[PDB]
Nucleic acid binder design. Structure first.
Ligand SMILES: [Mg+2]
Ligand SMILES: [Sr+2]
Length: 119
RNA sequence: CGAAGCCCUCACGGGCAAUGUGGUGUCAGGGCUACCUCUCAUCAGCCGACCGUCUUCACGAAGUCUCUUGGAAUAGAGCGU
């Protein structure tokens, strides 16, 4: 809410979570806010995911401003448990990162482009 | 480093845990990279006392002889242990 500056449509989110499921089974992904933050800093992040229902908002608060000064694209997910299932976890995840995509590189590229147009 | 983890249950199974269980590390700073050497430190865990002290208990030597006084010798005098 405080870190959210744009509303991502349900259709764009469906595409994004589908792309994340094939990103773990082919390439590699990072699960958890700590591992997402280190990826943006180490530069090894292609597309970063962040949940909208994070209480407290502090945990994830930094991701939008950090990704902007590191050129890493980001997208918002409405629910926390859906991002966890998409990353391949029984639990939820406040944030996930795609560390080098796999057979989804063409999809991720377009998702990164659809978000830039949405400001 | 990143689920490699913890709890309940005989098990089955359940619960916890990416908002981080668990590994590493804690100023002889540590970590990462590159090598040298090596450990007996530390932490976890097993076993598990002596002595001493306090209390309680068992065992444990040698006269109940003489005379006088006395209601009564545990007294006096005598002899003995
Ligand atoms: Mg430790
Ligand atoms: Sr949760």
């Amino acid at each position: 809410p405080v870190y959210v500056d744009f509303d991502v449509p349900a259709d764009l989110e469906d595409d994004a979570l589908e792309a994340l499921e094939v990103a773990r089974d082919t390439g590699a992904v990072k699960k958890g806010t700590n591992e997402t933050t280190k990826s943006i800093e180490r530069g090894s992040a292609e597309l970063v995911f962040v949940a909208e229902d994070v209480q407290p908002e502090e945990i994830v608060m930094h991701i939008p401003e950090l990704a902007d000064e590191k050129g890493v694209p980001f997208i918002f997910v409405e629910q926390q448990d859906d991002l966890g299932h998409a990353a391949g976890l029984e639990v939820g995840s406040a944030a996930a990162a795609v560390t080098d995509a796999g057979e989804a590189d063409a999809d991720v590229e377009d998702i990164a482009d659809k978000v830039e147009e949405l400001r």
